[PDB]
Scaffold this active site. Structure first.
Site, PDB file in Angstrom:
ATOM      1  CE1 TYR A 162      25.925  53.644  -7.383  1.00 57.11           C
ATOM      2  CE2 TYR A 162      23.763  54.145  -6.486  1.00 57.11           C
ATOM      3  CZ  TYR A 162      25.083  53.787  -6.290  1.00 57.11           C
ATOM      4  OH  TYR A 162      25.541  53.568  -4.997  1.00 57.11           O
ATOM      5  CB  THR A 197      32.724  56.086   4.968  1.00 56.91           C
ATOM      6  OG1 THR A 197      32.067  54.829   5.200  1.00 56.91           O
ATOM      7  CG2 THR A 197      34.164  56.007   5.563  1.00 56.91           C
ATOM      8  CG  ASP A 236      26.538  51.243   5.238  1.00 59.01           C
ATOM      9  OD1 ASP A 236      27.775  51.096   5.457  1.00 59.01           O
ATOM     10  OD2 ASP A 236      26.076  52.036   4.400  1.00 59.01           O
ATOM     11  CB  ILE A 238      30.673  53.835   8.790  1.00 52.85           C
ATOM     12  CG1 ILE A 238      31.236  53.534  10.185  1.00 52.85           C
ATOM     13  CG2 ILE A 238      30.520  55.338   8.566  1.00 52.85           C
ATOM     14  CD1 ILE A 238      32.601  54.157  10.448  1.00 52.85           C
ATOM     15  CG  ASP A 239      24.429  54.825   5.305  1.00 55.85           C
ATOM     16  OD1 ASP A 239      24.313  56.010   4.919  1.00 55.85           O
ATOM     17  OD2 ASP A 239      23.866  53.865   4.751  1.00 55.85           O
ATOM     18  CG  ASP A 248      33.784  52.358   7.274  1.00 52.56           C
ATOM     19  OD1 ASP A 248      34.573  53.202   7.764  1.00 52.56           O
ATOM     20  OD2 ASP A 248      32.897  52.685   6.452  1.00 52.56           O
ATOM     21  CG  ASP A 288      24.012  52.976   0.866  1.00 52.65           C
ATOM     22  OD1 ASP A 288      24.639  52.752   1.926  1.00 52.65           O
ATOM     23  OD2 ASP A 288      24.575  53.101  -0.247  1.00 52.65           O
ATOM     24  CD  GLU A 301      29.792  50.006   2.107  1.00 47.77           C
ATOM     25  OE1 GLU A 301      29.478  50.479   3.225  1.00 47.77           O
ATOM     26  OE2 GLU A 301      30.060  50.719   1.125  1.00 47.77           O
ATOM     27  CE  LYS A 346      20.991  62.006   2.485  1.00 50.72           C
ATOM     28  NZ  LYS A 346      22.281  61.717   3.117  1.00 50.72           N
TER      29      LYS A 346
HETATM   30 MG   LIG Z   1      29.435  52.056   4.454  1.00 51.86          MG
END
Ligand SMILES: [Mg+2]
Length: 317
Positions: free
Chosen positions: A251, A123, A118, A120-121, A46, A257, A69, A230
């Site tokens: 949330y 993780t 991001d 790593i989206d 990341d 994301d 992020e 996805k």
């Molecule tokens: Mg991430």
């Protein structure tokens, strides 16, 4: 009104990022993993990806801001040392310059030219050794102009990219020069629908999605996976509908994301809204403040799906 330069840079940088993550994943992951204060993980991958991308963006587009992020506030010394090794394969930066590059990602978004990263989206997907994505978008005043998703564990390693008005393309991670056009599926019956959702039980309401899909008479089991992959599944026609169902109205989803996947699905001919059918609004900062959850689809199935979603999620607080 054209963003060739930004799309070209994005492809190039995401391809190198996929090399980074893959290279990190050749070793044991536990000693490369940090648990942040919210108990979510961050790894050497990341941080390393973010250092590299932010530096490359700043080299070509010094005037732009970057929403990313991660930051260096809490990063352990053993983790950081590994980070420096991985980055110095691809960028000749000193340790301190690596720290600075990471921390370039502190933009709050909104007005102007912003990159959205991001590193790593998904993780947990990375740690699972199944789906994860390097996600990079570029936007002006909250309107997404460019979207790139690098998905190293998806069918041998795939990158999909789009810019606004110009369609969506698929490349292998090893070749960002020769791509193919991609399009969402043509499935017009919800009963024949391939539906996808998060693996993690706390990231989406899997009990309510069963009730949704049951009402939509879906016969196929759901495809559970981590990450913005996805969105790539939707855009390439591998699945028909992606649901992200919240358990409360409090949330708010992070823009890193969804920003790349959003544009990519739309340029591929599909549709992305929240659970109420409202278009996603990326102009309100680092989070989707005025949206709740996600429904992404091939467009044909969208409203039929939203109508059931809304009803089942009518009790939310
Ligand atoms: Mg991430």
């Amino acid at each position: 009104m054209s963003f060739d330069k930004e799309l070209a840079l994005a492809l190039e940088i995401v391809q190198v990022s996929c090399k980074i993550t893959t290279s990190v994943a050749e070793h044991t992951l536990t000693d490369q993993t940090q648990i942040k204060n919210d108990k979510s993980p961050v790894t050497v991958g990341d941080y390393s990806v973010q250092a590299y991308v932010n530096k490359k963006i700043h080299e070509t587009f010094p005037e732009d801001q970057i929403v990313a992020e991660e930051d260096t506030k809490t990063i352990p010394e053993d983790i950081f040392a590994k980070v420096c090794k991985h980055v110095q394969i691809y960028s000749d930066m000193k340790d301190d310059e690596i720290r600075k590059s990471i921390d370039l990602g502190n933009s709050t978004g909104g007005k102007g030219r912003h990159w959205v990263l991001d590193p790593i989206d998904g993780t947990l997907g990375f740690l699972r050794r199944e789906q994860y994505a390097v996600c990079l978008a570029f936007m002006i005043d909250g309107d997404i102009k460019v979207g790139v998703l690098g998905c190293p564990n998806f069918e041998g390693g795939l990158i999909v990219a789009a810019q606004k008005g110009c369609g969506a393309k698929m490349f292998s991670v090893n070749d960002i020069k020769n791509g193919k056009d991609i399009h969402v599926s043509t499935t017009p019956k919800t009963s024949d629908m391939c539906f996808c959702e998060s693996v993690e039980v706390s990231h989406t309401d899997q009990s309510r999605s069963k009730t949704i899909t049951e009402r939509l008479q879906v016969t196929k089991p759901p495809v559970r996976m981590d990450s913005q992959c996805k969105y790539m599944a939707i855009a390439s026609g591998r699945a028909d509908v992606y649901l992200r169902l919240p358990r409360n109205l409090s949330y708010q989803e992070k823009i890193w994301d969804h920003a790349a996947g959003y544009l990519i699905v739309k340029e591929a001919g599909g549709k992305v809204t929240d659970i109420y059918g409202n278009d996603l609004d990326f102009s309100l900062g680092r989070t989707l403040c005025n949206n709740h959850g996600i429904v992404a689809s091939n467009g044909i199935l969208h409203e039929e799906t939203v109508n059931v979603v809304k009803d089942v999620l009518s009790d939310l607080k």
